[PDB]
Amino acid sequence: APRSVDWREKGYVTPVKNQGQCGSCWAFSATGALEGQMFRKTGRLISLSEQNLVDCSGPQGNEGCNGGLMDYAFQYVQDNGGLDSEESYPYEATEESCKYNPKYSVANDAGFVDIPKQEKALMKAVATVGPISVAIDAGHESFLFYKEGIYFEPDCSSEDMDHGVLVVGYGFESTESDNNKYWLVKNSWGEEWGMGGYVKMAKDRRNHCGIASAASYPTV
Ligand SMILES: *C(=N)CNC(=O)[C@H](Cc1cccc(C)c1)NC(=O)c1cc(C(C)(C)C)nn1C
Questions:
Q1: For the domain that residue 98 is a member of, what is the CATH number?
Q2: Beta partners for 135?
Q3: Rounded CA separation 83/52 (Å)
Q4: Where Zn(2+) 6 is bound, by residue?
Q5: Residue 71 assigned to a binding site
Q6: Was 137 annotated as part of a binding site?
Q7: Domain encompassing residue 72
């Protein structure tokens, strides 16, 4: 792979969103990955509806504001034959009945790919595909209060992930030979969290916080 990647500078990534108090992180991770893949396909970045996923992807196994999986979201888009734009189907931060309208569909997918559970494979996928949906262990105060720098939490688990986010790149800080490496991660807690809503997360430390344990992307 390249030494560094940042898909934001290539037009693949919408601004940071805010999921509010709803457990819909999975929907934000999924829309982020599909926003990227649709851009790869068409050259047009269009913000997609998390609310559409929250309201409508129960049949695939999702549980709305009570949680879900990005792969189930990708399966919904495939089964449904579409996903509405954010503009047409705006975010309300609470579960409502499904009001999908095919007139306003701006995305589709033909399934998904689950990435092997290690960081070399994740790096390959980030470099060659685009932004990647991942889950992390975000269950520490250190994550809530994260400001800047490369996040490393001694108590992070590589197995207990609770939060879906989006890897939009990776790179290094300091002298290259110091191996001070990170994943560049878009969160859905607004721009006031973290570094404008982003976090740099420890890379190549044996799957810190489980970032490579549940990584996937939609096939477009
Ligand atoms: C975010 N606001 C709430 N978190 C979730 O919805 C997590 C995200 C997650 C965690 C681990 C792996 C992935 C790919 C995503 N969802 C879950 O923990 C979750 C939901 C479910 C079902 C829908 C099957 C009950 N299972 N898990 C593990």
A1: 3.90.70.10
A2: 164
A3: 7
A4: 160
A5: yes
A6: yes
A7: 1-220
Task: Measure the CA–CA gap between 8 and 114, rounded to whole angstroms.
Answer: 23
CA 57 – CA 13 distance, rounded (Å): 23
Nearest CA, atom 18, ligand 1? 162
Cα–ligand 1 centroid distance for 161 (angstroms): 8
Q: Which amino acid, 141?
A: E
- Catalytic residue list: 25, 163, 187
Q: With contact defined as beta carbons under 8 Å apart, do 25 and 163 qualify?
A: yes
Q: List the one residue out of 108, 93, 17 whose CA is nearest residue 55.
A: 93
CB neighbours of residue 205 within 10 Å: 16
Sorted by sequence, the CB contacts under 8 Å of residue 217 that are 6+ apart come out as: 33, 36, 37, 112, 113, 115, 125, 129, 130, 131, 132, 133
Total domains present in the chain: 1
- Experimental resolution (Å): 1.3
Find the farthest-apart pair of alpha carbons in the chain and give their distance in angstroms, rounded: 53
Residue with tokens 């997609």, as numbered in its chain: 48
176/1 Cα distance (integer angstroms):
15
Experimental approach was X-ray
